[PDB]
Design an enzyme around this catalytic site. Structure first.
Site, short mmCIF file in Angstrom:
data_model
loop_
_atom_site.label_atom_id
_atom_site.label_comp_id
_atom_site.label_asym_id
_atom_site.label_seq_id
_atom_site.Cartn_x
_atom_site.Cartn_y
_atom_site.Cartn_z
CG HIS A 354 19.24 96.12 -17.39
ND1 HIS A 354 19.65 95.49 -16.23
CD2 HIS A 354 20.37 96.42 -18.07
CE1 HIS A 354 20.97 95.42 -16.22
NE2 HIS A 354 21.43 95.98 -17.32
CE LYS A 545 10.83 95.45 -4.20
NZ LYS A 545 11.58 94.52 -5.09
NE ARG A 546 13.50 105.46 -7.87
CZ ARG A 546 14.10 106.29 -8.72
NH1 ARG A 546 15.42 106.26 -8.88
NH2 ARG A 546 13.37 107.15 -9.43
CE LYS A 551 11.09 98.65 -9.10
NZ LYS A 551 11.99 97.45 -8.97
CB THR A 653 19.77 92.87 -7.59
OG1 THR A 653 19.46 94.26 -7.53
CG2 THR A 653 20.15 92.49 -9.03
#
Ligand SMILES: O=c1[nH]c(=O)n([C@@H]2O[C@H](CO)[C@@H](O)[C@H]2O)c(=O)[nH]1
Ligand SMILES: O=c1[nH]c(=O)n([C@@H]2O[C@H](CO)[C@@H](O)[C@H]2O)c(=O)[nH]1
Lengths: 813, 813
Positions: A354, A545-546, A551, A653
């Site tokens: 992942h 998102k986290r 990110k 996703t």
């Protein structure tokens, strides 16, 4: 009201109403005079649940009779969200329940909000498992999700003074109507002890026993009458546990702490003993259950046929102990020879990777495994020896390859590399998007790919169009169904038919209408639930998102400040109005991520109250981001921020959810963004920034952030503002850690993509000024989103890894 | 099959069968192919439960409309046992369920054995509370039982090598179908903190909060359609509790430990902090609930009417903190003046004393109360001051009376005498049998009786004839109903009508037949469940009760050994065969009680395997004595051993159970034995030993056990046998502690009653040789057992303490 929500027949509505009244009376022990809205939710849930059980019993009966190959999806996370609406959707019950509750004088949508999220995951990995369960049931696979029933899921996030605060997610407080305890299938799990050698091989003795009690939750397929099972284990102390008296009873808590709480780390490894216990607990109980089911089958002792009847999918390395545990059972208990046991294990197990971030890789200290799982360490050492003998024979004299490929990592503390264990012991290894799978073969697992190339595959991630279109965006599902029918819901590739409507003026108007309605509904939600006001005519710019450095929520922050500074410089100049929404949780121990949250709120504090800005720019932090909030914000979005540094986000996703729901994407060529742009056409995406190759070139030369600071005056101004205390007047040095990181130790090269990002955002604003052309590009995105259905993903796993054929055929009702 | 078990109508049986099948399918998610006997039990329980809810809803509706005076029974123990059969009995459903299950191919009695006891009590005190709930509902009182929902009740007792072993009573493992969680009535409870003084009086601040979540269990009256509520509190941590992250979540266990486990002490005080927390927890949550219900009533702020609408009964001193807690609420929160608040408190509260043993009296260290409950200590000090001012005015210059009556006990550690608190703050104080209530006025509470004589009452204990005759002994209930009808079940005084059948040859035969059947059934149970063989023709000599020195299981042991030694001396002489059964649990920390258990098993080991004895004498220890076992052994008994030292057993209730079920009683003039003998006639009882007056005479002179040893050769032989290792060949000194206690420090004068006891036992054996005259005496006992119904007891509480009238009137169905 709407077609895709099914029929509301007179017979069905009447039956639902009376069963609702039965549950309120007999199950909840209430009447209409004393019932609270929560009571009404439970009466509805029990009523819908009843419709599941007949199908659930006959599905599991069917599997016992037909004895198909069984798929076991092992995960420490299942990010399920709410179950009520999903169940109604999959059973074609939504309109009927809507009508039935309306006639009882109740608003169904109000009742739906009462349900707690099953927040048994952190983010992408956990939500993927949930989408996968939905698709496996929809495709008629004999599949079981196995995990842990955490008493406390991901923490509820509160924002206090701009800072994240955590509180316990006590999701089971009011009860869970969906689960069924199965204390009759309780199984013992062993810890500690020591290894004894006899004439009949090794024996694991003097162990501490913890019981594993299963709770089963139904997983309905989309309108096919299939109901699969998610089985989650709960830890229980045996009754003779520690058996002065009072303390011994109180000490039962120690054993039961195993299933108490989800570790709240997203893409970060924490080497704590309790986490290791959780990982073994799920694996040991699950494997016993699998073997029991295998022995008690209509097939017919002989483990040669084990891989023909069983597939085990490892979701990341978290359940990697399945490999040595299967060996332990086969060798120590069933008395198979090593070579045969190993053949069976390899053919049974497959591993999904992942992430490539080094900090997320599981590397367990040998001393922990030595104390907790002494037999497993011995088996791992033996696996390693035999594996390295194969490497040595394939690449003679290559001594550094031997150290690189070893499952045992040498150093101050010896560690076991769980990723290496997984590759050695699985017949298939997959990444989660094309670019990610290529990176695996070229970089971190290059040595393994050279040894066993056949093992390496790609399976691009996907999302379920049931939850992520029909459930959360009924307005869009309906206008699509009006043109092309309902078949696309379980065959998302049919959305391509919408390309012939890109010049249809009626469709253009309806798509834009659905978005405005979604935006109004979300703008209303924000006022009612959080007393925050927004302009529904503005561009909804969202990054949810986290919170992670990779990110790059920080890059978004720099753009926001750039927009603010440009307005302050030329106030009377027209700018496209924006509502910038950022949301997501930070791991409690992740200091930098907590600082980024504080920064976002601090920018809001300045921007949202500047009279010169007006309603032209708003910055809002979306509190407590979770599955149920995603279902609300995603259909409301205009612009999807997918701006990770190239090579860091394996797939993503969230990106796919936004594409399916009529938002345009600004993003780097990272993860699944690459395949999304390929599907829609690069012209219909807002791609910017370094490619993977550009990042590597910068690394070889050396990344110097000062260069960008020196050459970009607008960037310099922002850094000065942060340093001087512009966004924190009372604590002028509050953000010194953020500035220092950006200037001196930024692993993710925020500055390097700043110029291209800001320019790309200008192009977004330009297109938004032309509603018709914005919407036409939107239609081109929705129409090409078909590849990203998890039905496609699961069909590929089924055919290319599990060796089973998917089926769209209905079971009898 | 039998009349007293109700009608099995075609309509009812058909409806039960289909509802059974509905629950199996929808509730248990099973079918007939996979269902276990446990599944079948649960299907039945849910089916019977359904019949309760309508009555439950309408009873509580009725109370809200009529607004009667409410009775609140506060107890830390509710020894409920099994609920299934009791519910069927009270609803007239037993025959119908028997028929319905028979037609489904199931044996109902087999299903009944699957249910776990609700073992939320230790013995007499806890079981009295359970009988009381049954009678209050049967007499139509608006009554609520309030307690704690322990996760672990009284430990399960295992016997290993003759020794008691304890294991956790995990009674909730499979779920409890009878309870309903009511998380909507969750209430905060405060601990620790400090007292702050303002202009507006005292404030209790900086407290730790624990939540109290209620679980409601229905309490059906006997065939009157009344269903009352037992509400038990469960401890829950608040969600911000201790809110590194993982440890804070795990530490929630600390708060929730309050409701984890029942303290397993019978008639013994242990001054542990966790116990104090339990006591306050039940009191604080209950009182808030009472006050809420009082304010939200059809009556209509003014606490003058509080005692007219509320009665609080304190079961022992365990909930004594109700007194200062009520004062705290009234004074600190409602702002009533002290004098008015005190008037209300006294008129509301009443206190039942359960023992005079000094070791059982609750005397809490001031330093514990200071830390845990600082405001309550201040209130107790103020209560004490005002009370002692009243004593000083009534008895001027009597300085020793002042120290004797003080709630505060002076010494090395200052303690609060909770019994003194209860007397001062209650309008009624009662003992539990005539002799006990007299002892209270003459000895331990003499000073208080002199100050306030009107406060002191007697309420002789009782047992419910539903559980303790109809349920456990249907054979006897039926032969009685054949003669005098069914009215006696709720009017036990009607059993007197049976005196006209003492010379009836048909009745004599039937009574003896019912006993033999019961004995055969119990002899079969022992073989099936414990592989122990007994002679069903022998006299069943039983002593079942908690193991205590005061209860003198040791005196029984001496008799058993006397019988063995007499047989060994004259083997070919005829003796009436006996099966001596002794059972009961010892508190885990009570060393002497654990030694007595070992002694009993050790005697069995010698006696049961001596070929010369044959089947003439058997000694069996009945393992895991509990309510469900009592229901089996009591109907099987011939002789009831009630042999406590005179003045030590306040009442006893086991004694009453045996009398109702056709056993004759050998006992001292202690507790309720006195009233039992008075009711039946002394000629129809086997009374022996010292009276209270004889014990006091012996104490004044000084009890010398050596005297008895010297003058009784048979007693000497036994002591020599114990000392020399006759009953423990491998560990000759095993019982040295028992011998030493008997010879040098016996508080209960075992030796002093030995001669009279053995001689009395000879008279029992003589009567048993004549079956017809044995049975005639039995009939005289059963016929006069009416006074000992808890319906009589509760009617007296209602009229003489609570100021409410009982009602046998049916509620509409
Ligand atoms: O978790 C399981 N639950 C089951 O019911 N089974 C089997 O399904 C059969 C038909 O329902 C049952 O006989 C049981 O053996 C099983 O193997 N695993
Ligand atoms: O524990 C309680 N449960 C209730 O239902 N009530 C009240 O009963 C009324 C009629 O059932 C309800 O309105 C509630 O106020 C109450 O006072 N205490």
């Amino acid at each position: 009201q709407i077609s895709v929500r099914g029929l509301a027949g007179v017979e069905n509505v009447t039956e639902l109403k009376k069963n609702f009244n039965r549950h309120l009376h007999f199950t909840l022990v209430k009447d209409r005079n004393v019932a609270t809205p929560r009571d009404y939710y439970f009466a509805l849930a029990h009523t819908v649940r009843d419709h599941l059980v007949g199908r659930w019993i006959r599905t599991q009966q069917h599997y016992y009779e037909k004895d198909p190959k069984r798929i076991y999806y092992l995960s420490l996370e299942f990010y399920m969200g709410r179950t009520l609406q999903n169940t109604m959707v999959n059973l074609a019950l939504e309109n009927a329940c809507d009508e039935a509750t309306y006639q009882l004088g109740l608003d169904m949508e109000e009742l739906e909000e009462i349900e707690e999220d099953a927040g048994l995951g952190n983010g992408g990995l956990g939500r993927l498992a949930a989408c996968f369960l939905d698709s496996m049931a929809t495709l008629g696979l004999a599949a079981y999700g196995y995990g842990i029933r955490y008493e406390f899921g991901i923490f509820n996030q509160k924002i206090c003074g701009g800072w994240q605060m955590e509180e316990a997610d006590d999701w089971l407080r009011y009860g869970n109507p969906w689960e069924k305890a199965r204390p009759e299938f309780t199984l013992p799990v062993h810890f500690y002890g020591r290894v004894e050698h006899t004439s009949q091989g090794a024996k694991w003795v003097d162990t501490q026993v913890v019981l594993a009690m299963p709770y089963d939750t139904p997983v309905p397929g989309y309108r096919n009458n299939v109901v699969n099972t998610m089985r989650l284990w709960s830890a229980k102390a045996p009754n003779d546990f520690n058996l002065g008296y009072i303390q011994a009873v109180l000490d039962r808590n120690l054993a039961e702490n195993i299933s108490r709480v989800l570790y709240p780390n997203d893409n970060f490894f924490e080497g704590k003993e309790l986490r290791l216990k959780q990982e073994y607990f799920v694996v040991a109980a699950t494997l016993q259950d699998i073997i029991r089911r295998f022995k008690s089958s209509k097939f017919g002792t002989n483990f040669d046929a084990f891989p023909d009847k069983v597939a085990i999918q490892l979701n990341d390395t978290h359940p990697s102990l399945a490999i040595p545990e299967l060996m332990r059972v086969l060798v120590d208990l069933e008395r198979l020879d090593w070579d045969k046991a190993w053949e069976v294990t390899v053919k049974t197990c497959a591993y999904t990777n992942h992430t490539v971030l080094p900090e997320a890789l599981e590397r367990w200290p040998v001393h922990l495994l030595e104390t907790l799982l002494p037999r497993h360490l011995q088996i791992i050492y033996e696996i390693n020896q035999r594996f390295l003998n194969r490497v040595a024979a394939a690449f003679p004299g290559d001594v550094d390859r031997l150290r690189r490929m070893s499952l045992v990592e040498e150093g101050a503390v010896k560690r076991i590399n769980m990723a290496h264990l997984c590759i050695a012991g699985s017949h298939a290894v997959n990444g989660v998007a094309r670019i990610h799978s290529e990176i695996l073969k070229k970089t971190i697992f290059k040595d393994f790919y050279e040894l066993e190339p056949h093992k390496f595959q790609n399976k691009t991630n996907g999302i379920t169009p049931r939850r992520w279109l029909v459930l959360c965006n009924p307005g869009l599902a309906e206008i699509i169904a009006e043109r092309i029918g309902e078949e696309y819901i379980s065959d998302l590739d049919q959305l391509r038919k919408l390309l012939s409507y890109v010049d249809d003026e009626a469709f253009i108007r309806d798509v834009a209408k659905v978005k405005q309605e979604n935006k109004l509904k979300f703008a209303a939600y924000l006022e009612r639930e959080y007393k925050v006001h927004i302009n529904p005519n503005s561009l909804f710019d969202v990054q949810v998102k986290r919170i992670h450095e990779y990110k790059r929520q920080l890059l978004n922050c720099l753009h926001v400040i750039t927009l603010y500074n440009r307005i302050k410089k030329e106030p009377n100049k027209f700018v496209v109005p924006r509502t910038v929404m950022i949301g997501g949780k930070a791991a409690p121990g992740y200091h930098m991520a907590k600082m980024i949250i504080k920064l976002i709120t601090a920018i809001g504090d300045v921007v949202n109250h500047d009279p010169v800005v007006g309603d032209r720019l708003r910055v809002i932090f979306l509190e407590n981001y979770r599955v149920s909030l995603a279902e609300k914000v995603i259909p409301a979005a205009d612009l999807s921020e997918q701006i990770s540094t190239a090579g860091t986000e394996a797939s993503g996703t969230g990106n796919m959810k936004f594409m399916l729901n009529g938002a345009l994407t600004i993003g780097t060529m990272d993860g699944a963004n690459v395949e999304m742009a390929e599907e829609a056409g690069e012209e219909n995406f807002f791609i910017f920034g370094m490619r993977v190759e550009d990042v590597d070139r910068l690394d070889q030369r050396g990344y110097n952030a000062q260069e960008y600071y020196d050459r970009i005056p607008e960037l310099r101004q922002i850094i000065e503002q942060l340093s001087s205390g512009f966004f924190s007047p009372k604590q002028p040095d509050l953000f010194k850690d953020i500035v220092n990181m950006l200037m001196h130790h930024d692993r993710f090269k925020v500055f390097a993509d700043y110029e291209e990002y800001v320019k790309c955002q200008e192009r977004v604003s330009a297109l938004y000024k032309n509603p018709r052309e914005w919407t036409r590009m939107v239609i081109r995105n929705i129409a090409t989103s078909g590849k990203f259905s998890s039905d496609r993903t699961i069909a590929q796993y089924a055919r290319e890894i599990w060796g089973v054929e998917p089926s769209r055929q209905r079971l009898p009702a």
